[model samples]
Target chain A: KDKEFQVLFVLTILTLISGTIFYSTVEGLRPIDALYFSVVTLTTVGYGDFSPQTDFGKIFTILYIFIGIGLVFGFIHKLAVNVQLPSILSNL
Target chain B: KDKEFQVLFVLTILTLISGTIFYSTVEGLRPIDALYFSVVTLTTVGYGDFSPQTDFGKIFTILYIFIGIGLVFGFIHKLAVNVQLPSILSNL
Candidate 1:
């Protein structure tokens, strides 16, 4: 039961953590900046404060966005559905 | 029958078109740059080539991202479902 949330949570965490690591190691950004960029990119709120400059970094970011956006959406969808279940049950 | 795709298409177009307008009007970005930013933000690729510089633009972008990301998700999800439907049907 509730397996969807668990899997989504893990995937989301993995994506964020791995993205942070990749940006930190490959892009040479500070850990905090890398994490911030990771979150901002996934949320699609990119403030243009930081971005990859290297060719490798840019390519990795492209791939990262593809996988990261889906996980972010999955996380949001699962949370929205679970959060609304109570209201749905009460209304019923 | 195919109303989901139609609605998603309209919303997706609306988000991009309006976003381009907002950035161009409020932020004074060139129309081309605004449109480019619109697509970049919605796709969450965010190359940092352009971004909002004004308070109004920033606020508008925050709201835009909220709605825009959902619409993008709807568009992607619909495309994925329809694209996979034939394969699923054949597999079963």
Candidate 2:
């Protein structure tokens, strides 16, 4: 993939991994569960079902959704830049 | 406002405002909640906090968010582009 696509893939992957690593450690979720939660959360359809347990978990969500939201923006920002890349390249 | 700024402002405002109106009506959420849902979903973050049930909800959530994300999702940078951006630039 181009750097543009690669970065997004990496960002999305790392973001999911970061959350999975945390959810598994802090919240005691299973491997897949942690992965699942990370994705669900990343997309901001954070469901109440299968949630983090500890106070830290709850706090984690409140804190990270704002964080995730930004990443999500960056996620699509990657796409937007890609979308406009041709236009930009032509204009450039 | 400059023409560019004005159009961007209008499109962005209209987009957000449009979602606010829909979320309130279709989801049966209060204005505040609907507005919240609008942003969360628009980011495609899909927090699943107040997703759709009826036909309108399904249709509304999917269609508009598609355009919104494609066009304005990158606006997240403008927030950080404005400063103190964390997460560090989000869409949903």
Candidate 3:
């Protein structure tokens, strides 16, 4: 339990930090702006504020959306499986 | 197990509802339009059909993203941990 909790904590933090770094570098925004943009993009809220002003930025945004979508979905699917597995396995 | 499953179910529904309300009220969209838009956004499919048009809407989206990202990721990370914990603790 402790190890699982630790792993989850680390991974979640890593995802946030990685997202911030990627957004900041690709979007050429300040740290705070990049962090803000990363969160929005990951969530797909896409308010359209501070959007990619450059062609490269737009391309990056496309890639980000593609990869981020999978990550988010994978997370949801995994959660569902986890909730069901214990009883399912015990019955087996 | 039952508690975890219930929590996950409630959270998932809550997320859907909150997203719909937020998008409909903030984006000035119809209920169906809002629900459609919310699912796409939450799923990160991002068809780009109905986006935020107002400046305040954009800003609200910014805040929503920050919070939503954490919620979505937390849900995923929780799933992952639950899947691995039983085996890991048993081995320990």
Candidate 4:
């Protein structure tokens, strides 16, 4: 459980850092702006404040969505597993 | 269980607030814009309108995805557990 938590923590940090970098570089926005936009995009808020202006940008954004959704789902699964594991193990 | 719910709620709010504040401060965007962008990113909508323009920003976003994905999955799992628990308890 401790290992799992550590792994999750590290992965989380890496994802955030990489995401911020990608948008800032490829999308041509500042780091903070990119991070904010990423949050909006991931959360499905659709504030419409900033958007991609190029074809590559659009494609990248879409790709991000696909990957993001999968990761979210995986995270949820991990949570459930973590909650249930101890009880199952103890019962045995 | 109630405590868990409360914890989850708090976590969710904190996640949103922290994300918004970080972006708005770092990226020079309005609070509303930052909040909106954060929602989109969390939900994986990826409208492609606004994006990051720096190495640090991209790194942050990538990190966000890793963390966000786990939380989202956890939320979904909690929902499922809540829905199923009653049935199991009743059977018992």
Candidate 5:
């Protein structure tokens, strides 16, 4: 339903915005770099390209990561919902 | 005959199987967790529920993520690039 997609949208926006802002402040990162790192962090790709230079900064990474993992399926469910199943599969 | 879906199907199979084998061996995960992590990693649903413990493993992640993200768009891209919806704007 609309409620689920709505939830997904809000979470995506929140993660992108909050991650961009906090990391930019915490690590003195450029906003774009902060966002690129933010998205990549939650993946195996956590290439550890960048990390906080301070205690509060590091503490915040722990919490920031905490919020993101669950957002994964919600985003996928939303994609699955919208990606109209092909006619070939729907008939099956 | 089914040219486009064929492309999607092949890519999906190759990514899932190859990813499972490589990550499981490199990270020392069980097969299920490896496959689970592989699928999640490809989807941007990457929770890092499994990850690389070695330096080489970490480097592989950076390389694979580019290919993995590309894997996400194949099915949709076929329609977008190949098909043109008859324009409804002129009628409206």
Candidate 6:
């Protein structure tokens, strides 16, 4: 129950932190820019304003997007679990 | 049960259709480009390759993102309801 949300939180933080660090180092983006990009990319708001120039950087972003996508859906699922289940069970 | 998914589907289609039409008409983008932008934008992938050029276009896009965001979470919630409720109920 709560453990699922906890895991989701941990994953969300790690994804944000790792992506910010990776882009800042590998893409040589300013730290702020890297953080912004990581957020936009994670949320899939890509805005396409800034992107990785290197092949490895591109690969990392691709991986990052997939991970972020999964995490987001998982996050939504956990919320649904907490909100929906108790009410439906109560009705029964 | 199914009605929720039905609403989600309708909303998803309407969002895609309305955004594509609006961008193509308002921004003068080619149909394919408008469709591409609509998909990317709706998915929050925004990619930033293209955006609304006019004030109305911008406002419409802002609305579009919010509607799409709600629809996506609703979609996830419906899925969770279907997958989770039956199992938990059965166990009890």
TM-score of chain B of each: 0.82, 0.72, 0.64, 0.73, 0.73, 0.70
Model 6 clash pairs are: A44-B44, A47-B47, A47-B48, A48-B47, A48-B48
Q: TM-score for the first chain of model 3? A: 0.59
lDDT of 4 by residue, A1-92 (tens): 75775575466446556667888998888777776666556545445566787888899889876767455444444544674445534654
- The alpha-carbon lDDT assigned to residue A3 of candidate 4 equals 74
Q: Model 6, A57: alpha-carbon shift in Å?
A: 0.9
Arrange candidates by DockQ, highest first: which order? 6, 1, 2, 4, 3, 5
lDDT of 1 by residue, B1-92 (tens): 26987888788878878987999999897666676677777786676777788999889888888878878877767754554334534654
- What's the best-to-worst order under lDDT? 1, 6, 2, 5, 4, 3
Query: How far out, in Å, is residue A28 in model 3?
Result: 13
RMSD of each: 7.1, 8.7, 10.4, 7.9, 13.3, 8.7
Instruction: Give model 6's docking category.
Output: acceptable
- The sequence of per-residue lDDT tens digits that candidate 3 reaches over residues A1-91 is 4454455445544665776786678767766666666656766666555588878778877887776665654443443345434444465
lDDT of 6 at A71: 85
List the pairs of residues colliding in candidate 5.
none
By DockQ, the best candidate is 6
Output the worst ten-in-a-row residue range by lDDT, candidate 1 chain A: A58-67
- Return the DockQ of model 3: 0.16
Return whichever of 4 and 6 wins on lDDT: 6
Clashing pairs in 1: none
Worst 10 residues of 2 chain B by lDDT: B83-92
Task: Identify the runs in model 3 with alpha carbons over 4 angstroms from their true place.
Answer: A1-39, A42-92, B70-92
State the DockQ of every prediction. 0.20, 0.20, 0.16, 0.19, 0.06, 0.25
Instruction: Indicate which candidate wins on TM-score.
Output: 1
Per-residue lDDT tens digits of candidate 4, residues B1-92? 76555555565677778778877877766888877776667666756465554556555765665456445545556656875677788899
lDDT of 5 at B60: 64
Residue A35 error, candidate 2, Å: 17
**Candidate 2 chain A minimal-lDDT segment of 10 residues:** A58-67
Give all candidates' CA lDDT scores. Answer: 0.76, 0.66, 0.62, 0.64, 0.66, 0.72
**Chain A alone, TM-score per model:** 0.84, 0.71, 0.59, 0.65, 0.75, 0.72
In model 1, the runs with Cα more than 4 Å from the true position are: A84-92, B1-47, B50-92
